[PDB]
Amino acid sequence: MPMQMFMQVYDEIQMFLLEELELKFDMDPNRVRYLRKMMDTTCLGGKYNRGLTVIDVAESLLSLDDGARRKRVLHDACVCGWMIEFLQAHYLVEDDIMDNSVTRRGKPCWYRHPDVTVQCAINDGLLLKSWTHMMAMHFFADRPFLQDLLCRFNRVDYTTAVGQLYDVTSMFDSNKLDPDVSQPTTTDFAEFTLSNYKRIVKYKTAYYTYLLPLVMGLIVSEALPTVDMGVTEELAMLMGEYFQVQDDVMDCFTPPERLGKVGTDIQDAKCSWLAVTFLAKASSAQVAEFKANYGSGDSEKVATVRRLYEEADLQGDYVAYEAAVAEQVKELIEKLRLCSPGFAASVETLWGKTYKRQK
Amino acid sequence: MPMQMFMQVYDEIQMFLLEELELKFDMDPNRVRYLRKMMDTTCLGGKYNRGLTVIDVAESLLSLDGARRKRVLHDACVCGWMIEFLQAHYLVEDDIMDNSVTRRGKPCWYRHPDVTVQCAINDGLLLKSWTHMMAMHFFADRPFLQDLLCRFNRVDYTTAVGQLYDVTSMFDSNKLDPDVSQPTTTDFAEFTLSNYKRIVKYKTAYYTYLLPLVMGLIVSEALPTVDMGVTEELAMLMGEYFQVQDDVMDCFTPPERLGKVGTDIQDAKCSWLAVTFLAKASSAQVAEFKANYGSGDSEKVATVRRLYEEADLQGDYVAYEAAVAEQVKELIEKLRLCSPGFAASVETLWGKTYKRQK
Ligand SMILES: CCCCOc1ccc[n+](CC(P(=O)(O)O)P(=O)(O)O)c1
Ligand SMILES: CCCCOc1ccc[n+](CC(P(=O)(O)O)P(=O)(O)O)c1
Ligand SMILES: [Mg+2]
Ligand SMILES: [Mg+2]
Ligand SMILES: [Mg+2]
Ligand SMILES: [Mg+2]
Ligand SMILES: [Mg+2]
Ligand SMILES: [Mg+2]
């Protein structure tokens, strides 16, 4: 049922976008055809956690009628859902390029498709982002909440690109960060700290993945101030950090077939949860062998890093991590429940889709 | 004068953005420094015609206290920087898409020794996001914010649509299929003036000509006073001519004057020169073009250039330029009737465009 509606609104949105292109942007059938495939490939095939969370929060805050309100709020919630899913699609298109990934959701990355050049793919990503603004303006033209909705969406979007900068520069000595001078990947790994890890993940993931679906659900249902926002943000940040930790762990240990995408973290010398957690507790010997093997495409070097992780009991650390998180989450959810029972339930439901995801 | 204050608002915007990053986004001094340099390198060193136009339109319209003049002109500077940052964003990504080497006498952003191509794509995105951040900050309390951001975003989308038209213009559109690789076009049957005019209207005309005019009008609280049909006609015309000029210069202007290395021939681009040549060429000439276009090879590039010079493209260009100046004049007069001050600012814009040696 939630999926049923969400996919009707996908049709509505696509229809509005591609037709507008044909009618007002002189677009030929072939390019409308290209863009329809692009849109389907890039936006569809995920679990839609972000999109569906907007619907669920809206519905939960509805009680605060001929049903006309319900029709309206839930349809606005579906559109906001797609705004975040299209924002996500944009990020993944560009991120697969930045990360030199090969596949995504069991398909080749968009930029890796035979008839998609890297240059078009960059622009297709840009198109994805612009469609978020185009759909909002079409559907929310007459809504009092439009300006606030767009202000917040835009803030989070900026936040996410700021986090991406943290991610993409995390393997380079920041003191030597300088446009005019080339610099290799870090050799001492001095900045692969848990502190620098939490900052990357808070900004690149937590805001758009957890805070924004919640905020949008609250905006469309006109209930944003009914909620302790300090507690709501604590929750989003924590759940968002945990989600990315899971993403990192899965990159290394989850078989590609379940994962859908091949893991690039070790080869990209990424500042992952695994690397920072290993380096903090490792012996000098272990640090040496890590440094000898990280950040190379070589297959046995990557298999050494995996053994080192297993030998250092990182799966054990993860279990302990997960348990600390779940306890914090539970405590914050009850704090929410006191004056926002409906919302706390939608947050519980979001947690259900996150906690111990086999994904 | 307009230049001095425009640069004063730049420092104000820069200080707001970088300070916000340190205070609210947990940014370290090292990355702030990288971002300051990025912002300077990508946003400064051009002519600022887009930005300066907003100020000039704003000033031309403040009749049709003195704190209002200070506020309207400050608002016009911020809008100017919005379009300049939007442009910076475009040029960062465009240089990557186009495989360009220099821009404004320096390496393109993504060619800087300490800029990875991956970071460059993202820096481009930061550039776009800064347009929104600056508007939200300076115009928070301004009744025109929603309308401003709506038109801004629409022009932004229009431009990315034109970029698609540009980047897919050398591929047979009948065989556009994500699942199947295709080489560049070999018959060039889609290199038409028609197809050319569409690329150019969308990729350049809207953000380069219409957006600065619109923004100047918005901050002047004077948008409904002008004929928008006529204003758009001018913008599209002025915008097409500007791009034609950009195309010609790519091929015939010494890099030193331009600041950049021409990639149009190499990238098999649907340039004004290409479509204009192909439309008038003999079959023998078309053949020579076909064997020489879209290749990095030095001598093939210089074959294409000679083919252009021999086909009197420079006469075609003079004639087109004349026809444009003719259509432009008439539209400005029509605009001058009900909107005298706006027409003047449009005429000043045309002055910065007509026969530019840029
Ligand atoms: C312009 C902002 C782009 C933000 O991109 C992101 C943010 C968060 C997550 N991802 C995709 C992740 P994925 O590639 O799916 O493993 P990762 O590259 O972070 O591991 C991409
Ligand atoms: C996402 C939209 C990107 C638009 O990029 C553009 C649009 C218009 C002009 N330019 C730069 C031009 P330039 O590279 O300066 O000669 P060109 O690449 O069109 O020849 C770049
Ligand atoms: Mg990735
Ligand atoms: Mg990434
Ligand atoms: Mg990952
Ligand atoms: Mg270019
Ligand atoms: Mg280009
Ligand atoms: Mg050019």
- Please tell me which residue of chain A has the smallest CA distance to B136: A151
The answer for residues whose C-beta is within 8 angstroms of residue B34's C-beta and 6 or more apart is A169, A177, A178, A179
Residue B327, domain extent: 1-358
Between helix B2-24 and helix B117-138 the angle, nearest 10°, is 100
Quick one: resolution in A? 1.9
Burial bucket for residue B151 (CB in 10 Å: 0-12, 13-18, 19+):
middle
DSSP assignment of B22-76 equals HHHS---HHHHHHHHHHHHHHHSSS--HHHHHHHHHHHHTS----HHHHHHHHHH
Burial of A234 (0-12, 13-18, 19+ CB in 10 A): middle
Distance CA A8, CA B322 (A): 53
User: Cβ of A119 and B97 within 8 Å?
Assistant: yes
Give phi and psi for A108, each to the nearest 5: -60, 145
Ligand 3 centre from A91 Cα, in Å?
A: 9
Report CA(A204)–ligand 2 centroid distance (Å).
29
Find where tokens 């690397």 sit. Answer: A275
B65 known member of a binding site = no
User: What's the B274 CA to ligand 1 centre distance in angstroms?
Assistant: 40
Could you give the CA distance from residue A336 to residue A51 in angstroms, rounded to a whole number? 22
- Are A114 and B28 an interchain contact pair (Cβ–Cβ within 8 Å)? no
Q: Counting Cβ atoms within 10 Å, is residue B227 exposed (0-12), middle (13-18) or buried (19+)?
A: middle
- Cα A6 to chain centroid distance, Å, stands at 19
Q: How far is CA B24 from CA A121, A167, A341, B17, B141, in A?
A: 32, 18, 31, 10, 21
Q: For a pocket test of ligand 1, which of A102, A110, A204, A258 has the largest count of ligand atoms closer than 8 A to its C-beta?
A: A204
**Are the C-beta atoms of residues A82 and A51 closer than 8 Å to each other?**
yes
Which of A113, A120, A158 has the CB atom closest to B179's CB atom? A113
Interatomic CA distance for residues A85 and A9, integer angstroms: 12
A106: left (phi over 0), alpha (psi -120 to 50) or beta: left
Contact between A281 and A292 (Cβ < 8 Å): no
- Please name the residue that has the structure tokens 């400005």: B332
Indicate which of A17, A39, A123, A181 best probes the interface with B, i.e. most B CBs within 10 Å of its own CB.
A123
Residue B180: which of A114, A154, A203 has the nearest Cβ? A114
Domain total for chain A? 1
Q: Which helix (H) or strand (E) holds B279?
A: helix B272-280
Residue nearest to atom 2 of ligand 1 (CA): A161
* Min Cα–Cα distance to chain B from A136, Å: 10
- What single-letter DSSP state applies at residue B208? I
| Interchain pair B178, A154: CB under 8 A | no
Task: Select from B116, B167, B181 the Cβ nearest to the Cβ of A115.
Answer: B181
C-alpha A121/C-alpha A75 separation (Å) is 30
B264 is in an annotated binding site: yes
CATH at residue A90 = 1.10.600.10
CA distance A130 to chain B (A): 5
Q: Which residues 6+ apart lie within 8 Å of A337 measured at CB?
A: A344, A345
Measured CA angle at B330 (ends B246, B232), to 5 deg: 60
Q: Specify the 3-state DSSP secondary structure of B105.
A: coil
Please identify, by atom number, the ligand 1 atom nearest to the C-alpha of residue A91.
3
Cβ contact, residue pair B113, A177, below 8 Å: no
| Amino acid at position B64, single letter | L
- The coordinates were experimentally obtained by X-ray
Do A183 and B49 form a contact (C-beta atoms < 8 A)?
no
